[PDB]
RNA sequence: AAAGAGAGUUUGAUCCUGGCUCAGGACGAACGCUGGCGGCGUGCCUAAUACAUGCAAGUCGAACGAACGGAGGUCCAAAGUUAGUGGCGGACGGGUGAGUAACACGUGGGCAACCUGCCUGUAAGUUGGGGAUAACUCCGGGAAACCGGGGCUAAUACCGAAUGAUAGAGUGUGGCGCAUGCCACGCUCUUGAAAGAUGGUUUCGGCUAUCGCUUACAGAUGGGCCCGCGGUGCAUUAGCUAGUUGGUAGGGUAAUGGCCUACCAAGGCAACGAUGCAUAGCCGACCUGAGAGGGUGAUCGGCCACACUGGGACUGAGACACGGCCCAGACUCCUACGGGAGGCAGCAGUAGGGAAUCUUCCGCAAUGGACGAAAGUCUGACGGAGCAACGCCGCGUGUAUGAAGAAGGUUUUCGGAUCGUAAAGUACUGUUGUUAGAGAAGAACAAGGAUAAGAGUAACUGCUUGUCCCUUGACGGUAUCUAACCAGAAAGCCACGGCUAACUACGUGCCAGCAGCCGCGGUAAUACGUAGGUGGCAAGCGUUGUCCGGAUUUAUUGGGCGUAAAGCGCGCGCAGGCGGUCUUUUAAGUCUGAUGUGAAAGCCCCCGGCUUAACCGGGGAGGGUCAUUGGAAACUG
């Protein structure tokens, strides 16, 4: 993070463009599956892409109208 | 207007026939969509109130906010609360200009007060929700005058309620005094509405 | 120690009170005493003042501006004042 | 008058206890999808990090230095409207919240222990002399900030004198208090003052008006000091302190005071939390809550502290002084290498940090400031415009009619249902929008000219008041209004098993994935993706972060301790808490009346003004274990 902090995320939809030394934006909430992940990722507001065909939950995932 | 969807849908989803005389309920009384001429479910004590709210919102056809700050205003008064709430209601210049015969639903009040072709006391008005008081007067300031809508409307009207008094000479219209519950819509329950906002 | 005018209301809409206070003060901050109300935007002014107070701040050596002179002249505590001072 | 909603989850099923999660409200908010307008507001919460560029505090010719027309001599030209020394202001106004756990702030008092320019009123006076100095001009050092020497000259610049203390001493009289002491008056001696400038009249001498200067006394204003009470975490922080504690003399300040000095004694504070560590500007107030309470100090108003870091003093009524001075420190810049200049936590603006915050705009028209007699100059205060759906409020994307039901999607028990009066058609309007025009308030003035009346005068001039004449707009052709055309140029987001409003089909098959919880996905998925449909809200809708509620889950209001967490293994006992019956007395607690105060703005109530609302204005109410004081004596003392 932005304090050097060692931070495990969620990736959230289908599929994803992410990769080692990219810039993430990393978001409030947790998930219960996961025993040592916290937090989600936002889809759309940095390097982090969209998800591809999506018509539901648009303002989420980060798609634009069609 | 605030909605400008279709007005039977409504209606039929609501249960009752608001702006109408059962013309909206005439056939197919179930609720819209593809479900609802098959069959029903339970309603609990939520559906009951959020029901009885909808009455209302889409009875005199004002966004929830509106509604809401509305009902918050009444609550200052003094009085049965749903009783205040429902008189403020029918104080809005939409609603007199609609049951005084100037026009014939909600939407076309609505549209022709935001017009301006009336006035009240000779000012020309283009806000709906312009709470009117007693003693205030309604005009046509000559601007529709000979317009087929209007004498359409003053045609098929029904009557008048004995709280208004209005005469066609000039086409003007004044409160006589503040209505009571007794003579109001009556198909709601206004013990509920209360009790929504309660929670 | 003037008897001051202080602008509040809206923007466009100015309203204005007659209050003495000190010159080295803020025009809205810290006041001594209100005495009147100045309502510009009517064509026929509407200017309610003490008339009493005024006088004591006029004894006392509280001098008015301008337009505070004006109202004090049209409503006559200027002439009350000097009737006082040759009484 | 006010007066409080619950649901899921431990089990094969129960009932309790208990935690976890959710349904609501609010942001100086951020991110995602989307986006029509108007009014009123808000916008570096992080780096008190570093700063290009421009502007933010100057003004007085009524105290001492201009071009033209133009006396005079076809040629040059005398007198008539414009730098600096000196006075006032720079201590106001504006910005930040670093530091500070303390008389910093809130509240209530005291100063018989104090100061105060300008403002107002009153009582007296503005009488006489001197020596200079900038400016200016020569000589030098000069890279440049600028330094020295010689000569010359003014003042409302500076310094003596005449006279004048309610200033110091000495005394007396009378009246008094809260101990020190206060007030009125009287006597003798010793000290302390001034400045003139613009006019009028007269004789010209004089006299006089306005603004000025010196002393004294009151008012008003702004400050200074002292005190009772009140508002945080840690005891896994127990002793701290030595000018400290008190006194005797002295110095110092506007004033009291170890504020400072010499001498004398060993004191002082602390389990009612001293000292120390950590965090933090304080309040009116804001959010939530049935209330008690809990959280916070965004905007605005009041107080306090700071101005690159640390220390100091001068001038001044007021500073130990944001855009003043000196020294040291870090950084930036110029240098001829000797040496110099600077401080945006002012208004805009740049770089960096951030998940995140705006134009290098107009005007002194209005209000208020500084200077002046006035015109007038300055005012990034302020009045306005620009950007950002950041928030509240308001309006629109049409209205009526239009069918066993256009056409086509979604399904079908493939007869049909559904989108749906929704369409086309039909009749109508222009709130918005386009085109063309009329177009306010905010403006009071100040000054200038006449007037009428007063005080003053020998008379004026002038002064105070009253009535008229003339002049002044950044916003801005802005709000607003008038006409013609147009359904045309204007709807999106989330959700649908239960909590919680709202279901069908297809695809996938413990994979893809969803998720706040119960948990769904292994071939018939109302929970995954899509399509149709439905529900909520609406130019907004969702997600995240922080706070309050639900949470009676710190229980005074309002919980408990046999077996669920919870009675020390027991005793003796200091401090503390509580205490049988009756009488008299006191008013510390208790209850009550009156006086003063608890600023403005904010919540609340009633009235109004904007076409309504938001918003704005007037009046009222609320809020304290508050100071003075008068009452009652049941209860605790
Ligand atoms: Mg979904
Ligand atoms: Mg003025
Ligand atoms: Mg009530
Ligand atoms: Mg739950
Ligand atoms: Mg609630
Ligand atoms: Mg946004
Ligand atoms: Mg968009
Ligand atoms: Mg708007
Ligand atoms: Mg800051
Ligand atoms: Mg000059
Ligand atoms: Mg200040
Ligand atoms: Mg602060
Ligand atoms: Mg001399
Ligand atoms: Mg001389
Ligand atoms: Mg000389
Ligand atoms: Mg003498
Ligand atoms: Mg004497
Ligand atoms: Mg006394
Ligand atoms: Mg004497
Ligand atoms: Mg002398
Ligand atoms: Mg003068
Ligand atoms: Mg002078
Ligand atoms: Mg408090
Ligand atoms: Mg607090
Ligand atoms: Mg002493
Ligand atoms: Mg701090
Ligand atoms: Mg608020
Ligand atoms: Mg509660
Ligand atoms: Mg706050
Ligand atoms: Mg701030
Ligand atoms: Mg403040
Ligand atoms: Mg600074
Ligand atoms: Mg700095
Ligand atoms: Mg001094
Ligand atoms: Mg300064
Ligand atoms: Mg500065
Ligand atoms: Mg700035
Ligand atoms: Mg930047
Ligand atoms: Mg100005
Ligand atoms: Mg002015
Ligand atoms: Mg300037
Ligand atoms: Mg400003
Ligand atoms: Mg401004
Ligand atoms: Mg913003
Ligand atoms: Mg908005
Ligand atoms: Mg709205
Ligand atoms: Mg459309
Ligand atoms: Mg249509
Ligand atoms: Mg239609
Ligand atoms: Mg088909
Ligand atoms: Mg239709
Ligand atoms: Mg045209
Ligand atoms: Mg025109
Ligand atoms: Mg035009
Ligand atoms: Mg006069
Ligand atoms: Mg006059
Ligand atoms: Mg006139
Ligand atoms: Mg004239
Ligand atoms: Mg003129
Ligand atoms: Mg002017
Ligand atoms: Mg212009
Ligand atoms: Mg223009
Ligand atoms: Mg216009
Ligand atoms: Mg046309
Ligand atoms: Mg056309
Ligand atoms: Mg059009
Ligand atoms: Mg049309
Ligand atoms: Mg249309
Ligand atoms: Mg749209
Ligand atoms: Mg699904
Ligand atoms: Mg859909
Ligand atoms: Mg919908
Ligand atoms: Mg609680
Ligand atoms: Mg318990
Ligand atoms: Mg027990
Ligand atoms: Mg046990
Ligand atoms: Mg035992
Ligand atoms: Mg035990
Ligand atoms: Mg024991
Ligand atoms: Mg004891
Ligand atoms: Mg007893
Ligand atoms: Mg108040
Ligand atoms: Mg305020
Ligand atoms: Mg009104
Ligand atoms: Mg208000
Ligand atoms: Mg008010
Ligand atoms: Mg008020
Ligand atoms: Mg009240
Ligand atoms: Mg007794």
């Known amino acids: 993070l932005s304090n050097g902090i060692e931070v495990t995320a969620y990736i959230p939809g289908i599929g994803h463009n992410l990769q080692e030394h990219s810039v993430v934006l990393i978001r409030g909430g947790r998930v219960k599956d996961l025993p040592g992940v916290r937090y989600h990722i936002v889809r759309g507001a940095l390097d982090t892409a969209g998800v591809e065909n999506r018509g539901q939950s648009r303002s989420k995932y980060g798609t634009k109208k069609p | 207007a605030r909605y400008t969807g279709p007005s039977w849908k409504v209606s039929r989803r609501l249960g009752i026939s608001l702006s109408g005389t059962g013309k909206e309920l005439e056939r197919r009384p179930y609720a819209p969509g593809q479900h609802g001429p098959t069959q029903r479910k339970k309603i609990s004590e939520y559906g009951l109130q959020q029901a009885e709210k909808q009455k209302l919102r889409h009875m005199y056809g004002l966004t929830e906010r509106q509604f809401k700050n509305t009902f918050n205003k009444a609550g200052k008064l003094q009085g049965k609360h749903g009783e205040n709430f429902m008189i403020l209601l029918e104080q809005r210049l939409d609603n007199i200009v609609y049951r005084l015969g100037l026009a014939r639903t909600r939407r076309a009040a609505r549209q022709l007060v935001n017009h301006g072709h009336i006035t009240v006391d000779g000012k020309r008005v283009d806000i709906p929700s312009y709470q009117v008081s007693v003693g205030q007067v309604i005009s046509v300031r000559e601007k529709s005058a000979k317009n087929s809508a209007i004498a359409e409307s003053l045609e098929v009207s029904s009557f008048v309620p004995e709280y208004v008094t209005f005469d066609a000479e000039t086409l003007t219209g004044s409160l006589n005094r503040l209505p009571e519950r007794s003579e109001l819509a009556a198909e709601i329950n206004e013990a509920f509405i209360v009790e929504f906002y309660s929670r | ?87």
């Open chain 3, 1 to 87: 120690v003037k008897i001051r005018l202080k602008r509040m209301g809206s923007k466009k809409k100015p309203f204005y009170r007659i209050v003495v206070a000190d010159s080295r003060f803020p025009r809205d901050g810290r006041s001594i005493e209100t005495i009147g109300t100045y309502n510009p935007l009517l064509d026929p002014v509407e200017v309610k003042i003490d008339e009493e107070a005024t006088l004591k701040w006029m004894h006392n050596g509280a001098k008015p501006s301008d337009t505070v002179r004006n109202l004090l002249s049209r409503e006559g505590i200027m002439e009350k004042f000097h009737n006082q001072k040759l009484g």
